[PDB]
Design a protein around this motif. Structure first.
Motif, PDB file in Angstrom:
ATOM      1  N   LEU A  12     -15.777  24.607  15.926  1.00  0.00           N
ATOM      2  CA  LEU A  12     -16.927  24.937  15.101  1.00  0.00           C
ATOM      3  C   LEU A  12     -16.619  25.962  14.020  1.00  0.00           C
ATOM      4  O   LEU A  12     -17.404  26.096  13.075  1.00  0.00           O
ATOM      5  CB  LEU A  12     -18.059  25.475  15.981  1.00  0.00           C
ATOM      6  N   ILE A  13     -15.495  26.668  14.118  1.00  0.00           N
ATOM      7  CA  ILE A  13     -15.249  27.876  13.339  1.00  0.00           C
ATOM      8  C   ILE A  13     -14.156  27.612  12.315  1.00  0.00           C
ATOM      9  O   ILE A  13     -13.128  27.003  12.633  1.00  0.00           O
ATOM     10  CB  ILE A  13     -14.880  29.058  14.250  1.00  0.00           C
ATOM     11  N   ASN A  14     -14.388  28.068  11.087  1.00  0.00           N
ATOM     12  CA  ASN A  14     -13.416  27.999  10.004  1.00  0.00           C
ATOM     13  C   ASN A  14     -12.968  29.412   9.654  1.00  0.00           C
ATOM     14  O   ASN A  14     -13.798  30.266   9.323  1.00  0.00           O
ATOM     15  CB  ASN A  14     -14.015  27.306   8.782  1.00  0.00           C
ATOM     16  N   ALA A  15     -11.660  29.657   9.733  1.00  0.00           N
ATOM     17  CA  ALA A  15     -11.121  30.951   9.328  1.00  0.00           C
ATOM     18  C   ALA A  15     -11.091  31.096   7.813  1.00  0.00           C
ATOM     19  O   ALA A  15     -11.125  32.220   7.291  1.00  0.00           O
ATOM     20  CB  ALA A  15      -9.717  31.131   9.902  1.00  0.00           C
ATOM     21  N   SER A  20     -11.278  33.844   2.725  1.00  0.00           N
ATOM     22  CA  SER A  20     -11.506  33.683   1.296  1.00  0.00           C
ATOM     23  C   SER A  20     -12.266  34.868   0.724  1.00  0.00           C
ATOM     24  O   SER A  20     -11.859  35.451  -0.286  1.00  0.00           O
ATOM     25  CB  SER A  20     -12.270  32.384   1.045  1.00  0.00           C
ATOM     26  N   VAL A  21     -13.371  35.248   1.367  1.00  0.00           N
ATOM     27  CA  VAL A  21     -14.177  36.356   0.865  1.00  0.00           C
ATOM     28  C   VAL A  21     -13.391  37.657   0.920  1.00  0.00           C
ATOM     29  O   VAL A  21     -13.402  38.449  -0.033  1.00  0.00           O
ATOM     30  CB  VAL A  21     -15.495  36.459   1.652  1.00  0.00           C
ATOM     31  N   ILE A  22     -12.687  37.898   2.029  1.00  0.00           N
ATOM     32  CA  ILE A  22     -11.974  39.165   2.156  1.00  0.00           C
ATOM     33  C   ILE A  22     -10.835  39.255   1.142  1.00  0.00           C
ATOM     34  O   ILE A  22     -10.642  40.296   0.494  1.00  0.00           O
ATOM     35  CB  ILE A  22     -11.479  39.357   3.598  1.00  0.00           C
ATOM     36  N   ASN A  23     -10.075  38.172   0.968  1.00  0.00           N
ATOM     37  CA  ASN A  23      -8.987  38.174   0.000  1.00  0.00           C
ATOM     38  C   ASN A  23      -9.510  38.273  -1.426  1.00  0.00           C
ATOM     39  O   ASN A  23      -8.893  38.930  -2.270  1.00  0.00           O
ATOM     40  CB  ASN A  23      -8.129  36.924   0.174  1.00  0.00           C
ATOM     41  N   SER A  24     -10.641  37.631  -1.720  1.00  0.00           N
ATOM     42  CA  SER A  24     -11.233  37.764  -3.045  1.00  0.00           C
ATOM     43  C   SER A  24     -11.634  39.205  -3.316  1.00  0.00           C
ATOM     44  O   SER A  24     -11.393  39.728  -4.410  1.00  0.00           O
ATOM     45  CB  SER A  24     -12.438  36.837  -3.181  1.00  0.00           C
ATOM     46  N   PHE A  25     -12.231  39.870  -2.325  1.00  0.00           N
ATOM     47  CA  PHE A  25     -12.576  41.276  -2.499  1.00  0.00           C
ATOM     48  C   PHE A  25     -11.337  42.121  -2.749  1.00  0.00           C
ATOM     49  O   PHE A  25     -11.330  42.979  -3.638  1.00  0.00           O
ATOM     50  CB  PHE A  25     -13.325  41.797  -1.278  1.00  0.00           C
ATOM     51  N   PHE A  26     -10.275  41.893  -1.980  1.00  0.00           N
ATOM     52  CA  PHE A  26      -9.087  42.726  -2.115  1.00  0.00           C
ATOM     53  C   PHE A  26      -8.199  42.330  -3.284  1.00  0.00           C
ATOM     54  O   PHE A  26      -7.230  43.039  -3.568  1.00  0.00           O
ATOM     55  CB  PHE A  26      -8.272  42.695  -0.826  1.00  0.00           C
ATOM     56  N   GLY A  27      -8.487  41.224  -3.959  1.00  0.00           N
ATOM     57  CA  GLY A  27      -7.642  40.808  -5.056  1.00  0.00           C
ATOM     58  C   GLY A  27      -8.283  40.829  -6.427  1.00  0.00           C
ATOM     59  O   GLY A  27      -7.575  40.967  -7.430  1.00  0.00           O
ATOM     60  N   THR A  28      -9.609  40.697  -6.506  1.00  0.00           N
ATOM     61  CA  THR A  28     -10.266  40.589  -7.800  1.00  0.00           C
ATOM     62  C   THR A  28     -11.417  41.558  -8.025  1.00  0.00           C
ATOM     63  O   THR A  28     -11.943  41.597  -9.142  1.00  0.00           O
ATOM     64  CB  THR A  28     -10.789  39.163  -8.022  1.00  0.00           C
TER      65      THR A  28
END
Length: 49
Positions: A12-15, A20-28
Motif C-alpha cells: 500500500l505504501i510508496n516511498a 520526492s517532497v523531502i529531496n525537493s525541499f533539500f534541493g530547491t
DNA sequence: GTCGTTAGTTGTGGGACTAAAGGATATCGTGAACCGAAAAATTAGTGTAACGGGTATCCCACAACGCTAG
C-alpha cells in the motif's frame, strides 16, 4: 481499488511520494542554502542566520 | 415628472523598477491483454599448379687493346 484479500500494508505504501517532497525541499527551496564554508566563523554565522 | 449630459470620483487593469560578476539545484500517483512491427542472428553453400615460346622489367659483372708485317 483493491477488493482481493491478497493485499498487505507493504504493497500500500510508496516511498517515492515522501522522498520526492523531502529531496525537493533539500534541493530547491530558497531556505536550503549552500553553506558558507570559507572559515569556521562563516559556518557559525550561516547556521545562526 | 422624466430623460439625456457632464464632471468628478471609484474600482480595476496594464506597465516601469542602475551598472560589473555568477549561473548548482528536483521534479508522485499504475490497468490488462493481445497483436503487429522490424530489427537482429543463425545457417547453407564453393576450393589449383605448372606448363611452351617470347618478351617486358630488375640486379650483377665486365668491356670499351696494342703492336707488326704485307
Amino acid at each position: 481499488v483493491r477488493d482481493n484479500e491478497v493485499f498487505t500494508p507493504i504493497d500500500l505504501i510508496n516511498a517515492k511520494t515522501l522522498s520526492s517532497v523531502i529531496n525537493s525541499f533539500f534541493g530547491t527551496n530558497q531556505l536550503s542554502q549552500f553553506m558558507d564554508q570559507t572559515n569556521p566563523l562563516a559556518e557559525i554565522t550561516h547556521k545562526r542566520r
